[PDB]
Design a protein around this ligand. Structure first.
Ligand SMILES: N[C@@H](Cc1c[nH]c[nH+]1)C(=O)O
Ligand SMILES: N[C@@H](Cc1c[nH]c[nH+]1)C(=O)O
Ligand code: NI
Length: 499
């Protein structure tokens, strides 16, 4: 049928618990569950599940007027008490959400009326509405689907209020979404969406060529990039490559030898030929990243000094730092210890593996011995949180997490960042200023705090920025131009109009 589409994703969508993370896929969570306010391209929010709201004079107590015509997909009603139960179920696992400051800010959530929801905060927290608009965790499953009054330990059926329903899910094969015919808002033209679980990038390309796939949508790992370029030349196909949405880099571990020496981290930053890396691994399709955030990110246009490819400088830095070449070897030594660094990455990811090989070859030219450790995704995430890495692939999160939610998350073991920053003398100051950037209502103070935080991180060579990556689309021409969602982790299926 024309109003049905088939697409692909490398893994199943997961249980679609609205209040957990791995292995739930964010775009899928955003198809089924909804927020109180909805994020916009211009950077604002609009009323969503909340029709309107008011706030106390001190800005700590917020009262939302919800919509009254909203039902979960199973018929049960969405009301303040339902909302209140969700927030409660979230905050029971508050430590897990500590990366997002709103989770540490909510003091109390009370259902006043059927339509009146009251939230109480520790402070007049300015990112309040924006953080409510995020995919997760502050979105709403039917309280009837809790397991023993909790969500943190699992849910029953993923029942939400969103315009899509998870109808069927088969492990390593497919997930199927049907339009929710009792959705409170405008109805999507598409009635059915079938996600074929196809882990391999090359297989995803082949599947598209068969005619069986209407739409591929995702980041730079979606298809091999030489194939995508080929596809873009094909008048029978449609392709798109958005403007950059986020940074891909290495996180260097400042608390683990030898990446604990500033001079090693700087030397590493000088050793990699990023342009050559990008041309070769990314097929010239992306741009070179010099800083944790691109200068187009709010608050990040700071004129930070780029590290250019300079192996001469790199080897000079190392020499001064006492890392010398012993007779008969090409790897440097300091106190009888070889300059070994462990680079961990997801072994099944083609792009990471390819970049890692390039990077390893680059560092060998400065006398650094990089060992590649490709592992399962879960093992990689585990190393990110406990700090068991020398260098680790890492990326930023896109709008609207960048930069504020991403900096916030640095303060706890969330992704790699906290652990990578442990060895820095000024780490406690950085964490303090991050807190202050989230607290201040003065733009001028916020500009300064961002400059100070981002400048330290840059000058202390915590990261090795590689590239700024894009979204890509491959589609049948009959679907027309495919739009992008304001939240980079969401896919705007509800906006696709078949013929
Ligand atoms: N935040 C997730 C990791 C993740 C992958 N993609 C998005 N987030 C976790 O720690 O479980
Ligand atoms: N750690 C948060 C934020 C994030 C956005 N993208 C990846 N992570 C989450 O996974 O929900
Ligand atoms: Ni995450």
């Amino acid at each position: 049928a024309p109003d049905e589409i088939t697409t692909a994703w490398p893994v199943n969508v997961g249980p679609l618990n609205p209040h957990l993370y791995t292995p739930n896929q964010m775009f899928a969570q955003s198809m089924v569950y909804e927020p109180l306010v909805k994020y916009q391209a211009d950077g604002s929010v609009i009323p969503w599940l909340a029709k309107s709201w008011t706030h106390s004079e001190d800005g700590k107590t917020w009262t939302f007027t919800l919509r009254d015509d909203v039902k979960f997909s199973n018929g049960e009603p969405f009301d303040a008490e339902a909302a209140a139960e969700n927030f409660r179920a979230v905050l029971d696992n508050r430590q897990r959400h500590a990366w997002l400051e709103l989770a540490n800010q909510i003091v109390d959530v009370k259902a006043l009326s059927k339509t009146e929801l009251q939230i109480t905060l520790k402070s007049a927290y300015y990112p309040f509405l924006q953080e409510l608009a995020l995919p997760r965790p502050f979105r709403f499953i039917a309280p009837s689907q809790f397991k023993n009054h909790e969500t943190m330990n699992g849910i029953k059926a993923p029942i939400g209020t969103g315009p899509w329903i998870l109808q069927e899910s088969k492990l390593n094969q497919y997930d199927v979404f049907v339009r929710n015919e009792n959705y409170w808002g405008e109805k999507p033209a598409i009635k059915k969406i079938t996600f074929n679980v196809i882990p391999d990038p090359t297989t995803r390309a082949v599947a598209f060529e068969t005619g069986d796939i209407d739409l591929l949508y995702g980041n730079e790992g979606l298809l091999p990039l030489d194939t995508f370029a080929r596809f873009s030349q094909n008048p029978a196909y449609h392709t798109q490559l958005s403007q950059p949405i986020e940074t891909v880099m290495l996180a260097l571990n400042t608390a683990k030898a030898p990446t604990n020496e500033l001079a090693v981290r700087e030397a590493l930053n000088y050793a990699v030929n990023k342009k050559s890396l990008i041309d070769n691994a990314l097929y010239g399709t992306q741009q070179v990243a010099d800083t944790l955030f691109a200068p187009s990110v709010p608050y990040a246009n700071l004129g930070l000094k780029p590290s250019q490819y300079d192996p001469q400088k790199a080897k000079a830095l190392l020499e001064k730092a006492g890392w010398t070449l012993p007779a008969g070897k090409d790897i440097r030594e300091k106190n009888g210890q070889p300059l070994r660094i462990e680079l961990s990455f997801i072994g099944t990811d083609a792009l990471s593996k390819s970049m890692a090989e390039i990077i390893q070859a680059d560092m060998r030219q400065i006398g650094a011995d990089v060992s590649l450790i490709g592992e399962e995704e879960s093992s990689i995430y585990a190393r990110q949180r406990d700090g068991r890495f020398g260098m680790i692939f890492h990326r930023t999160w896109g709008a609207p997490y960048d930069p504020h939610a991403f900096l916030s998350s640095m303060r706890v073991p969330s992704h790699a960042d906290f652990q990578a920053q442990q060895g820095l003398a000024d780490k406690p100051l950085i964490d303090k200023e991050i807190g202050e950037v989230l607290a201040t209502h003065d733009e001028t103070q916020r500009q300064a705090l961002y400059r100070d935080i981002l400048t330290r991180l840059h000058d202390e060579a915590v990261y090795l920025p590689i590239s700024y990556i894009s979204m890509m689309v491959v589609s049948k021409p009959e679907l027309g131009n495919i739009p992008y969602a304001p939240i980079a982790t969401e896919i705007p299926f509800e906006q696709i109009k078949p013929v």
